[PDB]
């Protein structure tokens, strides 16, 4: 996998 903040 699920999208992650960076």
């Amino acid at each position, epitope marked *: *996998q*699920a*999208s992650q*903040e*960076y």
Partner: nanobody
Amino acid sequence: TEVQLVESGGGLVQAGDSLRLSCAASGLTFSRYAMGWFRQAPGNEREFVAVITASGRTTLYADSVKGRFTISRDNAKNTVALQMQSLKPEDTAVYYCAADYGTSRYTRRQSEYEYWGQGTQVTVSS
């Protein structure tokens, strides 16, 4: 460059009204980019508003607009939208759309966006 992001839909509204911004993107593989909206008011630094991942499966909103603004994308038409409701004077700004190359990720950090539109003015009267 060959990449172009063109924002539209700005205008003058009364506090409490709604407005829908759109960005038309060309010259890039649109489905591979996170798309963000940013805004800058006179004498202030440009700031984060919202971002949507390349897949569209995740959205993130600035605290000041969460619950009022909605970001969406149309990968078949290469467009991004920002639906703005319950507008306030503090929302007056030039609104920019920007593209960040890469799937499965999203960021508030402006330095990470490769491409920027030229902006559309939103003005909210008391």
